[PDB]
């Protein structure tokens, strides 16, 4: 437009939408689990994905993805949220970190380790 | 700190000679001389087209490995160079050279850069009358550097000196071959050095 218009009104600033209500911009959040269940992905992909319905110390009821290949998660398991969309699962926004709390290191991982929070094999 | 471990492998990866063993990298043995190909399995695989980032990256790696440095340090040096007035590529190079280990190497107090660094570390080199033990020492021009007095007596250094007896010492430096001494005179230039570098590429890589 014309600078006069700008002067009159101003530019409507990019109010940055939050991708994550982990509240506060809380870089993690620990919480307890409603139900450990399993979900169908979408139109492109098909695989029984291991999810957890999670209640948080923020106060929200959000679903969360569990990593690895063999989990050890119950229900009143104390869990730690990572945050970060998986693409496939809808309504799903937060990962869980395996390695601390009631999510321990996935055994039989020796390559991709830290991301899954599993300790080192003492080499011979 | 150090890279440490397998060296001539880096040279192989680069494809242009390093002289990073010194001798050995001088004898028919750097693997560059006898073996001239990428390391690991696909060492003999028909060359992938290097993406334009990749070439730059490779060049940077070459350069960084040449003087034997941590990458953070290198980055800092680059930043400093950029901050300074002049030709960044040339000035940066000069500054890099102006590190103590490099100086030691180029004056031939040790025959390899790693070796030079080691020597610097243990309490061997003496800056204007006092020992310094840090590879990242920035030696400003017109500066006098010696071998230590009670460390004056070691055989290796003598041998190295002898090797540097007869042949030329880089234009910006000069050495005393008897009193175990050496001057760093001028802050080295682009044309003053025969490096395998193309510093422009490195600079470009850094920009991002």
């Amino acid at each position: 437009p014309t600078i006069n218009q700008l002067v009159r009104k101003g530019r409507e600033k990019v109010r940055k939408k939050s991708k994550v209500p982990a509240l506060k911009g809380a870089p993690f959040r620990r919480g307890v689990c409603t139900v450990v269940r399993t979900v169908t992905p979408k139109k492109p992909n098909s695989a029984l994905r291991k999810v957890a319905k999670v209640r948080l110390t923020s106060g929200y009821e959000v679903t969360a993805y569990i990593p690895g290949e063999g989990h050890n998660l119950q229900e009143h398991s104390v869990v730690l949220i990572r945050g970060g969309r998986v693409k496939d699962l809808p309504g799903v926004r937060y990962h869980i970190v395996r390695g601390v709390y009631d999510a321990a290191g996935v055994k039989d991982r020796k390559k991709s380790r830290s991301k899954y929070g599993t300790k080192k094999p003492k080499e011979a | 700190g150090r890279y440490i471990g397998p060296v001539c492998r880096l040279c192989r990866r680069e494809g242009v000679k390093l002289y990073l063993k010194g001798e050995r990298c001088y004898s028919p043995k750097c693997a560059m001389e006898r073996r001239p190909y990428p390391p690991g399995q696909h060492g003999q695989k028909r060359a992938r087209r290097p993406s334009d980032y990749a070439v730059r990256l490779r060049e940077k790696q070459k350069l960084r490995r040449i003087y034997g440095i941590s990458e953070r340090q290198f980055r800092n040096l680059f930043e400093e160079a950029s901050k300074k007035k002049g030709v960044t590529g040339s000035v940066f190079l000069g500054l890099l050279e102006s590190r103590l280990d490099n100086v030691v190497y180029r004056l031939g107090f040790a025959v390899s850069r790693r070796q030079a660094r080691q020597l610097v570390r243990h309490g061997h080199i003496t800056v204007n009358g006092r020992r310094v033990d840090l590879p990242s020492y920035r030696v400003r021009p017109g500066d006098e550097i010696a071998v230590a007095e009670k460390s004056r007596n070691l055989e290796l250094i003598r041998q190295n000196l002898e090797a540097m007896k007869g042949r030329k010492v880089g234009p910006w430096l000069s050495l005393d071959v008897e009193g175990m001494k050496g001057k760093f005179l001028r802050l080295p230039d682009r044309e003053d050095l025969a490096l395998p570098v193309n510093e422009q590429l490195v600079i470009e890589f850094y920009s991002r």
Binding site: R37, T38, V39, T40, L48, G70, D108 | -
Partner: protein, 71 residues
């Protein structure tokens, strides 16, 4: 690893849902939204409510299976 605890149980097809997600009244007991295998999708194999299909069921939560065998 590939942790195999998968229960290979048969069942009569109950309710035809979208996406080829067939409620299958199993020989085990309760019906779940068990969907169709990728193999079946590839070969173009139509299931109707009236077949005894094999559903490969998970022990974590018996709510979702997988129709593997053609009828």
């Amino acid at each position: 690893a590939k942790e195999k605890d998968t229960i290979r149980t048969e069942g009569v097809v109950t309710e035809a849902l979208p996406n080829a997600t067939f409620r299958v009244k199993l020989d085990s007991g309760p019906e779940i939204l068990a969907y169709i295998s990728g193999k079946m999708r590839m070969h173009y194999i139509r299931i109707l409510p009236g077949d005894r299909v094999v559903v490969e069921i998970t022990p974590y939560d018996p709510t979702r299976g997988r129709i593997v065998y053609r009828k």
